[PDB]
A paper describes a structure:
The human [name]+ ATPase [name] ([name]) is a protein disaggregase in the mitochondrial intermembrane space (IMS) and functions to promote the solubilization of various mitochondrial proteins. Unlike canonical [name]+ proteins, [name] contains a unique ankyrin repeat domain (ANK) at its N-terminus. The N-terminus of [name] has a mitochondrial targeting signal (MTS), followed by an ankyrin repeat (ANK) domain, and ends with a C-terminal NBD. The ANK domain is not only responsible for maintaining the higher-order assembly but also essential for the disaggregase activity.
Two mutant versions of [name] (NBD and NBDE425Q) were analyzed by cryo-EM, which again confirmed that E425Q mutation resulted in co-purification of an endogenous peptide in the central channel. After several rounds of 3D classification, 3 different oligomeric arrangements, hexameric, heptameric, and nonameric, were identified. The nonamer appeared to be more stable and could be resolved at an overall resolution of 3.7 Å, allowing the atomic modeling of the NBD of [name]. In the nucleotide-binding pockets of the nonamer, a total of 8 ATP molecules could be modeled. The conserved residues I317, I318, and F541 form a hydrophobic pocket to stabilize the adenine ring of ATP, while T358 stabilizes the β- and γ-phosphates through a Mg2+ ion. In the nonamer, 9 protomers form a 1.5-turn helix around the central substrate. The density of the polypeptide backbone is well resolved in the nonamer and was modeled as a 17-residue poly-alanine fragment. For each protomer, a canonical PL-I (399-GYVG-402) binds to the peptide through 2 hydrogen bonds formed between the main-chain atoms. The first is between the carbonyl oxygen of the substrate residue N and the main-chain nitrogen of V401, and the other between the carbonyl oxygen of G399 and the main-chain nitrogen of the substrate residue N+2. Thus, the axial step size of PLs is exactly 2 residues.
Numbering used by the authors:
A (entry chain B): 298 to 630, 646 to 663
B (entry chain A): 298 to 387
C (entry chain G): 300 to 487, 501 to 625, 647 to 665
D (entry chain H): 298 to 480, 503 to 664
Write the structure that this text describes.
């Protein structure tokens, strides 16, 4: 009852949105499935299973981590992270379940078996599930279908109410290419509507993948890669992760700079400010073939190296205020400079 | 508390310039990123991932070895070397 | 008897006999002082778990402690080596055999040793090598200090002191001390400190992966860590081994031995990080003492002479006469 | 008539609450079964059986000792404790019954046989019954078949008026997090049915043995207020020891209790909080007496070092290479002039 009122007040979708940005259709789909499960009537005969499709930088694993942060307070216990990268052969399926009698490690059992034995309602995440051998997905079949897993010692574990998340990155180039084509077509249509004076209709910023695309190109790619149609048939939701928009890129760079400023304020009590051209320059250092990781490793080569290199010169006292500005000599082309603002609104450049 | 003063005395850019001459852009980049790591102004949730593209026998292994020698007194335990040419098959 | 313990605190004796480990010695000294003041709970014995690398001094610390509490180690020191107890049936070396079986009248070894001296310090040496079932045997010995023999007899050891030396989480703390070797030596009194959250967030997974019982680790009073030797501690170890050999020579045949400040560096150069004090010990025993024994067979060392160890411009033994003239010794 | 009057006046639950705290569901269950015992309305053909389950240091074996102390004034004579740790092998069952007539030591008999011959009404504590071999417990239900065990010499012992308490640590984990997930707070019947029952049946391997048990008792780990109450009870105990041995009065703050509850581990139980009380309060409390800094009749207060208070008041996430320093408890002699005198050795 009190948990119901907490869910009606603050759903998991606002927690995901305040933790990770964008991905509104993906957050809607995952939160809808959690909404069906948590409402006290979900079919216990089959567990919820998700497959995530998206590019390299988009936080599918981050979304799974925040979903498991929502579902259980213990991220170390209630959430089982499992990389599929080291399950590259068929005999690696032994690490999934254990060992037959008469062999080493038979007394220890299997990892996912005992980790599902400790808590049956666990959020089990499979990272890079496309990069494992298909005979490892073969044992994931009857795990997903009925929630029963057989140990190497004859024990059967019911993961009947568990939640399984798979993160895969196949067909990411095709998803990104078709999303870019849809966005440029919608931008051309919207610019023609603007030039023809149509502004009385709320042009909502949500472009969706059709079912025909989902059956026609993505489905044979998934069928060619996973090479078992029953494995795609057992998956309850297929969730797509669209590439970032320009305003989403701005929201991402402000989120990362706010993380840096919050770390500085809660560790050394230093306040820092950014301008609009600085944010535009930081968006300009984005690679399309990657995503938020490109920003996550160019901000330090653009900004935080200049903050850290100033820090051994003792130029940053307690309570000082910094502002990052685009370089006036490099406004024509492109570098950033720190600028400490005094109490009398005077500015000092850091060499 | 004396480590930042020691690095202010002898930065690793000068140590690497003494050990390896040439390619000062590489030295500046690795020194800046290492300085961000060892100052503490660095996101600890991800490791520091360097990629070096170079010609054959230009000093990249020597650069990583001197970086590990600067970071760790014991390079037998504090440094790992792996040859990817052996690891062809799965 | 407070005057005697004020004259000779055990920290002074321990630092006199073992070097290094300023925190471990202080920890065991604080616990033994709590026992000495008469304000420990008399129902519960003291249980210690020692975590340290090879050749650091855990077994020697337990031996010196039990040398302090009891004057005779044949009665007041009960040491059981866990290297025998690798199997599940080795349990039957603590308690007696069940009645009607072989060796039933022989009785329990640990029950007999605790019955000979109930106050005796018990050292469970190298508890890494024990089976996990033997841990559950001495579960009740740590819980109440009460052990039941195979004949129905029952021994009480509430006043006894239980020391266990282990090797399980020895690497990680050393790795922790590795950053401390890059922090506490670069902090330049100065000390090497292990963080308090480390014992509960990282060490307890190794202790649970090895001992597997929460109750075993809960029954242990104190967890005492041992830190790897620093440079000055290795210097003090080299001078201590050389002083031991010089004292032995002066007691035996009145032979004075001298080493400069510069000599100890080449002996610290003969050190393995994976080894411990025993590496420095047998390096001193090999490089220096073999020349002394070879000269002692050859009658090249008359009594009352003065010898100096000198580094080559090899450790050469040079006779120093009253006229300040170095004489090299030619050893065949 | 006096026994019924003292049962009306002082029932054993109040004595239990004086001796041990928390676990009021377990106290009520064991006390109600003992009330069923002491009014004479109990079947003698099935002696009362308790199977105590809980974590480490949660309150099982001290509760069994306090039950033994309540029923029997001479606990060393009228209370029998058997550690099932030694009975890890099958042949240790020969410890129970004694030898066959002639083999090595035959006239000695089993220790249980002699101990129940001396007192048939003695409460018997099989503690850590999970440490025993699965074979041994398949003898044990014959001791609950009709309350009889037969010696090798034929000396059958009748123990109808006995109380058989077995403590264990099977399946204590999800019981502990099930008590955690509910924050009277008691275990649900559904969790008793569909979780702990198949684990018990699979571990014991003979479900007739679970048939022999009269009552399964579940223990729950400690909440915050009862943890503070443990700190208050332990400092009361140590102050009482200082009064009856050297006349020393101790005062401890609510910040002191907050500091001592900050040093707690859930899995280790009350032994961990007892050890951190002993390592910090008792340590300098006796180090002061080593220098004779505490005269007889003096009065002390416990304070906290000022450095770690500002760290504790700000709950910030630390780095894995960060070093967390414990707040340090300092002794102060409180003078009659409303003044404090610190102790620094
Ligand atoms: N939309 C987003 N909002 C906030 N942070 C994001 C977002 N997308 C990515 N990130 C950040 O970038 C990281 C990239 O995601 P993560 O490494 O968890 O998995 P992934 O990108 O799904 O993985 P993969 O390499 O398999 O594609 C996240 O951990 C997060 O810090
Ligand atoms: N700190 C020390 N100071 C002086 N001598 C030491 C020290 N530590 C060890 N030694 C010497 O080295 C010997 C080796 O120590 P010992 O045999 O007690 O085992 P240990 O160091 O505890 O290791 P292990 O775990 O292998 O038993 C000691 O007997 C002693 O002679
Ligand atoms: N009810 C209780 N509340 C708090 N602490 C308790 C309680 N009962 C016991 N303790 C503490 O725990 C210690 C162990 O108690 P006891 O030997 O009776 O077993 P237990 O806690 O029930 O469990 P275990 O047998 O697993 O150790 C006692 O010495 C005491 O310090
Ligand atoms: Mg990922
Ligand atoms: Mg030693
Ligand atoms: Mg017990």
């Amino acid at each position: 009852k009190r948990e119901a009122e907490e869910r009606r007040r603050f759903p998991l979708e606002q927690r995901l949105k305040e933790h990770i940005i964008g991905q509104e259709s993906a957050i809607a789909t995952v939160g809808a499935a959690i909404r069906r499960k948590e409402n006290g009537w979900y079919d216990e005969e089959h567990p919820l299973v998700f497959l995530f499709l998206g590019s390299s930088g988009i936080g599918k694993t981050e979304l799974a981590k925040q979903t498991a942060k929502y579902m259980h307070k213990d991220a170390k216990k209630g959430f089982i992270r499992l990389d599929m990268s080291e399950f590259q052969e068929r005999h690696e399926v032994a690490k999934f379940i254990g060992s037959p009698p008469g062999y080493v490690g038979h007394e220890e059992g299997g990892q996912l078996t005992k980790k599902l034995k400790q808590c049956p309602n666990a959020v089990v995440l499979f990272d890079q599930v496309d990069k494992a051998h298909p005979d490892v997905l073969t044992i994931m079949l009857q795990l997903f279908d009925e929630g029963r897993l057989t140990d190497g010692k004859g024990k059967t574990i019911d993961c009947k109410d568990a939640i399984f998340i798979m993160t895969s990155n196949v067909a990411s180039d095709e998803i990104a290419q078709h999303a870019l084509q849809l966005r440029q077509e919608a931008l051309e249509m919207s610019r023609n509507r603007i030039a023809e004076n149509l502004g009385d209709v709320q042009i909502s910023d949500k472009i969706t993948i059709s079912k025909n695309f989902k059956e026609n190109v993505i489905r044979p790619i998934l069928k060619a890669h996973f090479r078992r149609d029953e494995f795609l048939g057992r998956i309850n939701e297929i969730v797509y992760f669209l590439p970032f928009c320009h305003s989403e890129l701005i929201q991402l760079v402000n989120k990362e700079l706010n993380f840096w400023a919050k770390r500085a304020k809660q560790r050394h009590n230093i306040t820092l400010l950014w301008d609009r051209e600085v944010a535009d320059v930081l968006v300009d250092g984005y690679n399309v073939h990657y995503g938020a990781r490109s920003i996550k490793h160019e901000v330090e080569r653009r900004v935080v190296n200049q903050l850290a290199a100033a820090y051994e010169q003792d130029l940053l006292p307690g309570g000082c205020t910094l502002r990052i500005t685009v370089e006036d000599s490099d406004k024509q082309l492109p570098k950033l400079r720190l600028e400490i603002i005094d109490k009398d609104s005077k500015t000092r450049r850091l060499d």
